[PDB]
Curated annotation (Swiss-Prot):
Catalytic reactions on record: Thiol-dependent hydrolysis of ester, thioester, amide, peptide and isopeptide bonds formed by the C-terminal Gly of ubiquitin (a 76-residue protein attached to proteins as an intracellular targeting signal)
Residues of the full protein shown: 1025 to 1191 of 7096
Subunit structure: May form homohexamers. Interacts with N protein.
Signal sequence range: none
Topology of the protein relative to the lipid bilayer: Multi-pass membrane protein
This protein's name: Papain-like protease nsp3
Native species: Severe acute respiratory syndrome coronavirus 2
Amino acid sequence: VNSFSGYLKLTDNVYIKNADIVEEAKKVKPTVVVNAANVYLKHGGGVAGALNKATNNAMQVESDDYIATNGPLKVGGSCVLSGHNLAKHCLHVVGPNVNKGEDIQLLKSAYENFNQHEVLLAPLLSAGIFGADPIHSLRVCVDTVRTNVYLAVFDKNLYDKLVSSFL
Ligand SMILES: OCC1(Nc2ncnc3[nH]ccc23)CCC1
Ligand SMILES: [Cl-]
């Protein structure tokens, strides 16, 4: 039993809800919140900009030190950093950004990072301003993640469309 509330159950381990991931994280304070990151951990917009804003820029400060030490992530890769006031940990995961010409096949690799954590709150990777089809992202999530994932989906038209089209 966990404290996630109001989710629709899609499969044994995947759940989905129309929600602002920032507001969800503050309420639940999950062990792991997933950020829709880029390789530079520059949290400007989309989910990343919203999460970082909610941390009063502490996420960005921590991220800049991480990059200065370790260099950029790989597309499809991840790192674990602090969750600040939102979660115990933040798993920064880089899905491919179609508006940059990045290979969509890397979306499966990106979701594989979720399997290192028993329970996660997360957005749909490569959706939103990363330019991929959210229906496709949901399919890859369901077919790749085996741990318990709670998917937030801020946009309402996307959520109903995602629920109504799910196979
Ligand atoms: O899930 C991916 C999508 N973006 C978000 N989801 C959940 N919470 C969010 N907060 C800010 C952006 C955001 C892209 C379409 C939904
Ligand atoms: Cl977005």
